[PDB]
Design an enzyme around this catalytic site. Sequence first.
Site, short mmCIF file in Angstrom:
data_model
loop_
_atom_site.label_atom_id
_atom_site.label_comp_id
_atom_site.label_asym_id
_atom_site.label_seq_id
_atom_site.Cartn_x
_atom_site.Cartn_y
_atom_site.Cartn_z
N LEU A 103 0.84 -1.19 0.00
CA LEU A 103 0.00 0.00 0.00
C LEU A 103 0.88 1.24 0.00
O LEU A 103 1.96 1.26 0.60
CB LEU A 103 -0.93 0.03 1.22
CG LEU A 103 -2.03 -1.03 1.29
CD1 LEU A 103 -2.78 -0.93 2.61
CD2 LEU A 103 -2.99 -0.91 0.13
N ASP A 104 0.41 2.28 -0.69
CA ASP A 104 1.09 3.57 -0.67
C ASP A 104 0.57 4.42 0.48
O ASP A 104 -0.42 4.09 1.14
CB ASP A 104 0.90 4.29 -2.01
CG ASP A 104 -0.55 4.59 -2.31
OD1 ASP A 104 -1.15 5.43 -1.61
OD2 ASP A 104 -1.10 3.98 -3.26
N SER A 105 1.26 5.53 0.73
CA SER A 105 0.88 6.38 1.86
C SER A 105 -0.54 6.91 1.70
O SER A 105 -1.31 6.92 2.67
CB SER A 105 1.88 7.53 2.00
OG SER A 105 2.19 8.08 0.73
N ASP B 193 -2.90 5.46 0.39
CA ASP B 193 -3.81 4.37 0.72
C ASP B 193 -3.99 4.23 2.23
O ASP B 193 -5.09 3.91 2.70
CB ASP B 193 -3.30 3.06 0.13
CG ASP B 193 -3.34 3.05 -1.38
OD1 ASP B 193 -4.12 3.83 -1.96
OD2 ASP B 193 -2.59 2.26 -1.99
N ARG C 218 -8.14 11.49 -5.57
CA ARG C 218 -7.00 10.58 -5.58
C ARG C 218 -6.33 10.56 -6.95
O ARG C 218 -5.10 10.53 -7.04
CB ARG C 218 -7.45 9.18 -5.17
CG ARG C 218 -6.36 8.12 -5.25
CD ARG C 218 -5.14 8.50 -4.43
NE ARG C 218 -4.13 7.45 -4.42
CZ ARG C 218 -4.13 6.42 -3.59
NH1 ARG C 218 -5.07 6.25 -2.68
NH2 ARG C 218 -3.15 5.53 -3.67
#
Lengths: 127, 128, 88, 459, 122, 71, 171, 55, 81, 62, 221, 12
Positions: free
Chosen positions: C42-44, C46, G37
């Site tokens: 997961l990315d930040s 996320d 996003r």
Amino acid sequence: SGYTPEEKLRLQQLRELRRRWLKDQELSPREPVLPPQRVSPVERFWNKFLQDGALWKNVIYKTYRHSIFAFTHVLIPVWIIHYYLKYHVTTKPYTIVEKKPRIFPGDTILETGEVIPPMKEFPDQHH
Amino acid sequence: SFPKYEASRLSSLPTTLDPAEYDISSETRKAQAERLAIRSRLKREYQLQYYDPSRRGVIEDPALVRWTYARSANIYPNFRPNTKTSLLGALFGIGPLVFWYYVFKTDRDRKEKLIQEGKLDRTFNISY
Amino acid sequence: SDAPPLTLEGIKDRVLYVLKLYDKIDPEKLSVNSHFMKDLGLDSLDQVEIIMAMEDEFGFEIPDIDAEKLMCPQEIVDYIADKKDVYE
Amino acid sequence: MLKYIIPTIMLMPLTWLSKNNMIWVNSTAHSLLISFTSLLLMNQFGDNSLNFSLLFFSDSLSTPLLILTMWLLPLMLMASQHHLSKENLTRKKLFITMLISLQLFLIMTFTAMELILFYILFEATLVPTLIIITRWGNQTERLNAGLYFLFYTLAGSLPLLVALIYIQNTVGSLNFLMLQYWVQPVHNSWSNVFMWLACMMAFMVKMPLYGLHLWLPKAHVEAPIAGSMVLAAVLLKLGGYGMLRITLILNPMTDFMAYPFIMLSLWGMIMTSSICLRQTDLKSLIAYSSVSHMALVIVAILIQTPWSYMGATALMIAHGLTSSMLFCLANSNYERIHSRTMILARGLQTLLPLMATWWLLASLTNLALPPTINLIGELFVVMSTFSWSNITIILMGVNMVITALYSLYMLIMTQRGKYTYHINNISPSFTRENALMSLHILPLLLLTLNPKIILGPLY
Amino acid sequence: GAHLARRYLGDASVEPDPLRMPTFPPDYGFPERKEREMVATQQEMNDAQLVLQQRDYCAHYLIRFLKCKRDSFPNFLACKHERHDWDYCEHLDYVKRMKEFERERRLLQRKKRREQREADMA
Amino acid sequence: AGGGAHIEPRYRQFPQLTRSQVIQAEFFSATMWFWILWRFWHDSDAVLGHFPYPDPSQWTDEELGIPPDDE
Amino acid sequence: YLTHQQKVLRLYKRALRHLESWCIHRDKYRYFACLLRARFDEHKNEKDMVKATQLLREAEEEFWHGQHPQPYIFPESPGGTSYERYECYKVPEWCLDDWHPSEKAMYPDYFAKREQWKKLRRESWEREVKQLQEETPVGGPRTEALPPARKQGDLPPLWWHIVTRPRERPM
Amino acid sequence: HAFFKAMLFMCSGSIIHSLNDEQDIRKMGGLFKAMPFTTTALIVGSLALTGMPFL
Amino acid sequence: SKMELPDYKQWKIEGTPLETVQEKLAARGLRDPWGRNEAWRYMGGFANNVSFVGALLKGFKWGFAAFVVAIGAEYYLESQK
Amino acid sequence: EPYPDDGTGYGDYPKLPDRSQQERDPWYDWDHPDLRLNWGEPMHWDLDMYIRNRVDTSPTPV
Amino acid sequence: MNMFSSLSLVTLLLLTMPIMMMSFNTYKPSNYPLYVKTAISYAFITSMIPTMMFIHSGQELIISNWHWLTIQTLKLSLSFKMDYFSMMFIPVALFVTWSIMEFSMWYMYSDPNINKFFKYLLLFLITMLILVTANNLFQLFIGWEGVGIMSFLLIGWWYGRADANTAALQAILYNRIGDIGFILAMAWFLTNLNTWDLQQIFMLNPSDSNMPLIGLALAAT
Amino acid sequence: KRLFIIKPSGFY
Ligand SMILES: C[C@H](CCC(=O)O)[C@H]1CC[C@H]2[C@@H]3[C@H](O)C[C@@H]4C[C@H](O)CC[C@]4(C)[C@H]3C[C@H](O)[C@]12C
Ligand SMILES: *C(=O)CCCCCCCCCCCCC
Ligand SMILES: [Zn+2]
């Protein structure tokens, strides 16, 4: 970005302590250790008599609570106020001033019996 | 793009829009290190006393003391009479007294004549 | 005010339950001890949207100064228990 | 008045001949017995004042102040016990002796029928009041506060001594009863203008008047608790009592000479009320409050209307009980944290629930919540000044707003909020402190049921 | 109403002046108009404690309403008929108020035509 | 608090109800409309007018007393 | 100061919450949550710190014009409708030492447990000062974080107030 | 006025407590069936304030 | 007592307007990985919520029948006496 | 930065930004949470005006 | 007249009885909230008897029970004016307060200081009935100021919340400004009409009234 | 599950 190993260990050190502290903020089954408080005959009489639901009597028990209230809070104060008003207040001039009653045409007066003529005959209307 | 935000006395400029929270030079971050250095030492000194279980009382705060001494006791010895203080004193001090003197003096003399001449109404005025 | 308390297990159950609905993890491989950035990929951004989901679950905000230091579901349960005073 | 003078003198032999550890019980018990017998001065008639002898008399203006004076002595003894405990026995007896002499001089000052006898006793209160401040104050500023208090009064008292003597050489007598019948109008000449100033400036400095008030924040702050209670309760009321007496022989010159002292007062209420909104010292805030409330008495006395004299008399009795109570409440905190800073201790209502209730009642009376006697007197002064000039309602109303803000600001700052974390020695309230506050507020609230006894001769 | 535009956005002399009315003589234009009479007497109204605003010609029907109100207690769901008679009598009195406004309106126009007629011809 | 039913709190489901709750709630709503309809039926005048407002223009000078322009 | 990742992360949460305040309905918020996003996804990585800093300022300027005038706030957070509501029931622990013995006897067990806690506090005090005057730079500390107890049976330095604080719903 | 404005505040309190001390209406909804009795009163009051005939 | 959490899989975005958002986002190549979390709000007993007009029309059907029958009694009552 | 030496009796007291206490980092662990202050921090000359009860100089949306 | 007056003064005396019993005369810590509500319930019933008598014959009487203070030619008494406005508002306040009082037992059941909360609500109710039934300005002024200060204590009930203190103090800041007008009204009526009694104000209808009325408008603002 | 509520001394 997470906790460094030193910090994550410190948070765990405190976490065990705090949970123990919150566990100690609990009361044993005996507490509070109330002192020798005495109960009046009325209080103990109702505890024995109120053990069963007995919907038929809950009205009676409610009546006692309200009847006790009415006499002390509605009947004694009105007694005192009425005695105060009738024999002390109303014995002085203009302490209690009352608006004179409205007198309509065609009425009889209790004090003397005067009768006022009804009216002049109306020009009958409709609708 | 969007209209600039105008700071004011009662409306500060948000830290995001301040053009000094993005560039961080070598010296800019050097100073911020000392800010957390001096203020880190104070947090240490306070906590040595705060947590001490043999201490019962008040942790005297010299910053608090220097504040009151400056607000009350250290004002006059640093007062120099000049055009700035002399004029503000006459305007704030003498000014309002003179203003209210003429407002009340004028009104009462005006009211007095209306009683001598009978032009004033005092039909039911017997409580003074 | 009459709201039943939150037990240690209850915090974990709802913490895991919310993660399983996030379409970025394998439910079978997802346990309480899973590093978002090092294990589950997961990315930040996320993780931030995981905290926002976590706050709306327990109904209370969490600071960004500390929310950017939670990297495991277990750490989330510890933070809530510490804040909400859960002992057993 | 010998039935009160002699018993007061006997408090000194009692204090010095009593056991080492029973001095606070003997003096407190018997000073309360003197106060009880002072209710016999309420034998007042609707036509003539109560005249006892050639020297002393008591009327509806002196009686409430006599009762207040004798009531305070027992209270001041209670408040002094804590900070004198570690004091040498010999010096702890001299402290109790200064208070006794102060009461002796005060009751003789409020009953003197001859103004020169009033002046001598009026001026004798400075000596014991100075020694209390200078000897038993804590800070280093007591020495300088002693000089400010001493010399502000004398700079106006010495001209009063010449003016009083000049009146005797012209009228022939200073007996107050004589002055009510032989009084003559005051012509408009430059000599009479300065006669007016000499007769009044002594009483303006003691009220005090705005612009001559720099001694109050020093004397009421550096003085011990006993000194602060008497200073703010009866020694400010010597100024008011003096003017209520000596204005009989200043008419009609008071019609125009009163203007400069009404603007300094009406404007001084706002300035001193505003100062309280930014004070960093809790004792100082209470002091500047005395100036604002004492600025209404000055206005009331100088416009000379029956409603204003009733208000002034009620304002003086009301402020003496309220002002003393506030000083006592401030000192109870000081006895724990030993600092006067107002922001140092916060959220005290969490630790001391009952002492917070005394704070609430003390604040309401300060802002004249009806039907307290604070409001009765403050209302009459506002009713009388309106007839003087309807524009004055603008200034009276503004001050009532600012009074509410600073009265409730100190209540919020110290009682409400969140407690200071490192203040860990706030022990519960002793029975002495709670009894000390209750003796201030209970009699104050009881006078609401029969306020006619504190409205003065013009009632 | 709609007359506001005429008074403000139109001619002035045509529209009446409610403050100064009546203006023309009370009898001019009619053959000895019969005075409007009032059944209720001054003493009668006083004994009923009638508000001054209710001491109008419509009185002697409100007195009927009050008596039914007292003689039907508790029966507040009654005396509706006597309510209508007093309402109706006020309605007739209110109606005549418009008549004076309308009558007064046109009589002003006559003063314009007559003054205009003599002014125009001369 | 003191009394009432003991319906458990659903986690993510619709909350439980009780017979008396729904009946009593549904009862008053019906009583409102009956009062509005019944009141409207007997005194619709109050909410639609009581008496017809005469039209000023439809009158005639005969019932007003406007003399002819000639005199 | 606050690095560069933190600001964009902080800036991203506010955009979602402020946007969430307009959306209200939960179907719309997801419709635009992904777009936001995506907008960050357009400029992800990309290096060029000079260009990234330039974009963020425009992003902050873009945000301020679009912030909700009355943002949603959780009740128990600064600016909410319950912040500090329960600080008036949070009595500190030291106030229990002043109880009258006649009212300590109503909780004999609780105060017995308090004695152990106080006993532990006095014993462990000396080491915590020792532990702190050794694991610290010469010129005083430079960070607010405290080190843990580098041993078994030793409590972390400065633990008393962090541990024994009042509960969040004390009554 | 006192009746239906007093009722409205009480009915709102029911919503607030049931939602864990939540006042903002942007985190509410779907209470027509969950709280019928409050719903009925919130609608009876919401109409008296508006001024529906004969209420 | 222990809390019994319902099954996590049963919350299906299908039918609800949340998948529609995924469908609408898919039209431009975008996915929203939270649809299921909000799925429970549009299903179960929360679905088919009444409309505003219906809320104002609550109880009218039951109340209306009372009116028609009631006025009928009045008409009969007038005739009798 | 000391105040201007213009003779208003400010002495050498440290002048500080005129920022109200309501616009300080709230989540931080202040020694005085109510005031947003730290033991030993140099208090502003007008601190009693900027407490959260009286004056707020926070940025406004408009 | 005897029943009309007695049943109106008992209403006010009844409301204070729970407050008088706060002096540790009867100690029911867990039943005091129920005690207060029962008092308000019995006050509503007793207030209906005066209300009906004013419906039947429109009976109105003025009570001046106590002679408090007499300043020269001005006489102040604790007077009560039972008329149209008093006899219709009193049932409504108690009826509505009855529901709020009953509702509060549920809403505030968890509050540790619920006993203090039901004393402040009852105290406010008393100060409203003093304002409502006042026959002279000073008595009206006591209630006018009283309701203000009780509102201050109730608004800042959660006194650890700095926002509550600000809102509580702010509510006394605005009403004090209005109080300027009320003092102005009291001043004008004493100067020119030589009275505070509402009876004498209405019986000496002054042609010029712009000043006193302006005060009331400012006060009511 | 009763918990001990810390309160200031209510005896004095
Ligand atoms: C009447 C009321 C509720 C009764 C009921 O359940 O129906 C009950 C609840 C608490 C009771 C009161 C409290 O006990 C306090 C008072 C002391 C005695 O109980 C009698 C009078 C007293 C004033 C009581 C009157 C009445 O019995 C009360 C008021
Ligand atoms: C007369 O008093 C009318 C005053 C204005 C109130 C009515 C305003 C709205 C009128 C709209 C309808 C116009 C007629 C078709
Ligand atoms: Zn001490």
